[PDB]
Amino acid sequence: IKKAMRKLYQVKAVKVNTLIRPDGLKKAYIRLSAAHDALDTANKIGL
Amino acid sequence: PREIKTLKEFLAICSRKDARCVKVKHNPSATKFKVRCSRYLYTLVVNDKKKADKIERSIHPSVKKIAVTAR
Amino acid sequence: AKRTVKMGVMGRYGTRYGANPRKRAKKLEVSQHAKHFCSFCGKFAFRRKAVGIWRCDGCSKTVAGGAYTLSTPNNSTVRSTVRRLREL
Amino acid sequence: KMKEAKDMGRHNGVGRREGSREARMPSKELWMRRLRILRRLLRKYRADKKIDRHVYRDLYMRA
Amino acid sequence: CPRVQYRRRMHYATRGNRMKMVRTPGNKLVMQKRAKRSQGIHTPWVLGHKRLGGTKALRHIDARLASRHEKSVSRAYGGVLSHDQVRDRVVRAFLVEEQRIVKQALKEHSKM
Amino acid sequence: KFLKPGKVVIVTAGRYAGHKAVIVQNSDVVTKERPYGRALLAGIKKYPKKVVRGMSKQTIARRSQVGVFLRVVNHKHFLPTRYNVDMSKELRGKINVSDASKRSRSKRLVRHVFQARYNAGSSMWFFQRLRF
Amino acid sequence: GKTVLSCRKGNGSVYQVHGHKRLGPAKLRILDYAERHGYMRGVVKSIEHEAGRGAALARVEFRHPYKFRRVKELMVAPEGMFTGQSVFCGQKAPLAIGNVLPLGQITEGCIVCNVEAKPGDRGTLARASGDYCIIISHNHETGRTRLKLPSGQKKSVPSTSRAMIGIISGGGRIEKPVLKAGNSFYRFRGKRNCWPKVRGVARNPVEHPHGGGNHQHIGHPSTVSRHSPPGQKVGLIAARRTGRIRGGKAVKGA
RNA sequence: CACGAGUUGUUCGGAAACUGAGCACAACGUUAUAUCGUUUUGUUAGGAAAGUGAAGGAACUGAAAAGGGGCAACAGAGAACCUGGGAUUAUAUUCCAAAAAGAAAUUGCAUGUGGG
RNA sequence: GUGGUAAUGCGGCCAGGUAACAAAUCAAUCCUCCCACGGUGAGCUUUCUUUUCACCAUAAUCCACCUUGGGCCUUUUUACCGCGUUGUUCGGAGCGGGGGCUCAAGAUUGAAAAAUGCAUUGUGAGUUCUGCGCUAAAGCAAAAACCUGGGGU
RNA sequence: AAUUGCCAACUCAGAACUGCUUACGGCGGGGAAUCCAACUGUAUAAUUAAAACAUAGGUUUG
Ligand SMILES: [K+]
Ligand SMILES: [Mg+2]
Ligand SMILES: [Mg+2]
Ligand SMILES: [Mg+2]
Ligand SMILES: [Mg+2]
Ligand SMILES: [Mg+2]
Ligand SMILES: [Mg+2]
Ligand SMILES: [Mg+2]
Ligand SMILES: [Mg+2]
Ligand code: NA
Ligand code: NA
Ligand code: NA
Ligand code: NA
Ligand code: NA
Ligand code: NA
Ligand code: NA
Ligand SMILES: [Zn+2]
């Protein structure tokens, strides 16, 4: 997940926490390094 | 956390390339200089106010200084 | 003072198993909880640790013999014969 | 208030006792207290050299 | 008065799951696990099984990460036998070898 | 026993338990510093190893080296044997311990004498190790 | 009817021995070259008690004949054995309590234990608490020895089978009355599932040949034949005689 | 009942990686028939069940080691982390960001220093 | 590798040890409850009450280094008498006195740590882990993993 | 020192005065005999808990 995060969006992830949901899907919480703004990345993604 | 016994040793530690920052705590009696190195926190306890001010105003370049206050 | 007239260590059974069986078990119980003589170390130091195991805390030693006593009467004949044959 | 009264000894009579004498104050505790007191006194006297070893041993046995 | 709960997902009071009560700087009472202990380094069981002088009783990771002084002594058989056992073995070795030499020399002198 | 200088003893207590030594100097009069009878002992803390044929002279010497110690020991802490190693009055006079310098010099002299004796080939039992 | 209990026990389902706490089979040394042509010396290390057995067991340490190693054996202790004792096994052994020697070398009239029936069996006779054999005679022509077994019968064995000198330890055990059902409970908890014992006359006809009736009785003689099928062979089996014996007691056995 | 949400771990529990009462794959035997039996009292099987250390002149090659492979304990053995939070609507010894609120312990591989 | 008379400081193979194991009695630390002194807030107050209630906290991980319970060393040697427990015992196979080495559990000083939390610092009782070393014809599971030594290398 | 101070924790015993409407809860009725089984135990889940079964002790058989 870290490698894919870096490849898809040119950002660096310092932590990934994962859980599998009661409906069967897997969800990840990805924290970016302080050199990157998650708000800027979210705007680029289109959130 | 480890405690330093001498000013020379404290100066060497503060000059160590891994020393990230130096925090200064002003107690009603003594002054504590806490150096955050990579693995440990080193604290030097100084009793004399004049000596403590001399060290604080002295030069420890390239290391950030933090004044510990209640936030 | 004396605490029982004749029913000694067997006084823990109450009135419960018959006079003759208690009298028969008393001798073996007394001998099994007694302290026996140690030929080495020359003193009374042997104590039972299980049905045939006797242990002397002075010399730090364990000996095999007897269920409720250190030496059976049958073994005396064996030791006497062995010593005599060795003497010959 | 009742505790001060009972410290003066007011509500601990025959008609108020409900448990056995040994339940209220066991005898083994009394014996251990007494014997330890006596042994402490004997040791102090022997140390202060009021009595000798010969007298001490006899008193230690009779206690 | 306050009452406490288990915190480490095992809820049985066995000899390995022992707990102690602690009051924290935040003024609450919690449960903390009590570590298991060891009996220490001993003399061989057939020779008496006595605790050896100069050695420490350390558990698994502590024994792995400690230094040699803690678990041994500078004498011979350090950390295995005691001083009296070592002395007895030394004397027995010397005396037995002397008896053997004398007996063999006597046999050879009778032969020749 | 009869503790004379030149006799061979076996240490039974302490770090050097089981090693062999020679009585350099005996003294049976108690003092305030040492309230016991004692002797000065010159033992060997490193026995010469075993040498077989087909060995280079370098390794032969390296494995024929020996090492010594010089200490004062209580009478109870060694056992006396019937063997002897010759010690002269001149050698005993040259041996002494009163400071670090004197101790080191005496130790070097004792080691040299022992190496000479082992090379000469006398007193083989003294240089064999005790297996226990 | 249904299966009888003595036949149910032959499947050995819940009727097998309780052996988790046992230490292993007790046996003499292996009959090898050193024992056949000389002697070996061992030292007694410890004396222990094993659940379900009345005698003591001894741990004896030897040296491996061929490798650099130590070998520990487990035998049944004779009476008098102590820790630190030296034990000799083989041909050239002396005569003392605990030594293992051939029967041809043991003198006539001696008391032995742990006897081998066939050379190499590692001991099968006289192994319970206070038992022993007696050597009766030697016969140098055929190389056989006659003994008196603990039961009173006489048996001839080859002179090459080994035996140990002395008497087994733990004697006098059955002289103490038990007095309680709890004591029997604890005695059999270390052996096997065989206690308590119900009576055939107290069972029902579907279960036992003796069960049933308006009074508790056996309707037929309780002496049964040697050729009876399993399930019919309950009672006194192939008895030669019954009742209380008046006079001398003979030996029992074939 | 309808719609929308919620479970975050180098260290907690398990597995990776122990053995127990026990089970039964291989091998062998038996059966018209394997869908049967033996298989821990050191211990398969008439039974050739070991596949790599050091080597020397970068991988290959082969000496020494009797007794085949595996499972069975979320209460036995084993097991490197603790507090504070104004941090949720619902999770937390799992979340908190450069003054990490913070302070530690431990594993693998590398780099400098000192000693050797 | 190296100090101390010593107990014992400090820088393939083979043999042992830890893991590893009952009851009772008596007695610590932690925690809980109570009492006595103070400080802060609230309640009662026709009358009485120097009063009633609540609170006054300190995690892991680390430095330096006194008690009381075992084992031992050295010195002076014990006349069937001496030592010791609530309790069933110990002594020329080494009692007691002087001086020491070591282990287990606690205490203290400090770093953490006030920068946090909330709106003091002394007694008595009860309870755990711990220590007091280790019924029975019933006598206290095993292995991995790890530790130390003997040798050779 | 067989003397002086300072302090804790509760228990037992004795006395004078005074009162009862016998007043929470909790807590064995006792004695003399006969039958059976020695005793503690087990045991027909859902009409039988016993004098039945077990037991220690005794004897016989292979
Ligand atoms: K099968
Ligand atoms: Mg997860
Ligand atoms: Mg019926
Ligand atoms: Mg619904
Ligand atoms: Mg577990
Ligand atoms: Mg875990
Ligand atoms: Mg919740
Ligand atoms: Mg108790
Ligand atoms: Mg009845
Ligand atoms: Na009493
Ligand atoms: Na029938
Ligand atoms: Na009947
Ligand atoms: Na009948
Ligand atoms: Na198994
Ligand atoms: Na498993
Ligand atoms: Na019924
Ligand atoms: Zn003895």
Side-chain angles (χ1 to χ4, degrees), chain G residues 176-188 190-218:
Chain G
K176 192 199 232 202
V178 167
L179 299 176
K180 289 168 52 185
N183 294 350
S184 268
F185 172 88
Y186 287 117
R187 151 152 84 130
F188 291 109
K191 296 166 157 320
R192 79 201 72 86
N193 169 12
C194 71
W195 186 89
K197 301 170 136 330
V198 187
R199 280 174 294 113
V201 291
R203 311 175 187 176
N204 272 322
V206 74
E207 284 137 43
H208 203 260
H210 290 189
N214 283 346
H215 306 265
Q216 268 193 13
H217 78 300
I218 319 152

Side-chain angles (χ1 to χ4, degrees), chain F residues 8 13 17 22 41-44 47 49-50 55 61 78-79 83 101 110 114 117 122 125 132:
Chain F
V8 153
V22 183
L41 302 168
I44 58 200
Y47 290 87
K49 281 192 208 113
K50 211 183 73 213
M55 248 179 197
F78 60 81
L79 164 85
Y83 303 84
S101 40
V110 155
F114 278 179
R117 293 294 233 280
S122 39
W125 189 91
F132 65 94

Side-chain angles (χ1 to χ4, degrees), chain G residues 70 91 106 109 147 207 229 241:
Chain G
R70 293 274 158 82
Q91 294 255 324
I106 304 162
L147 326 162
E207 284 137 43
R241 221 210 44 101

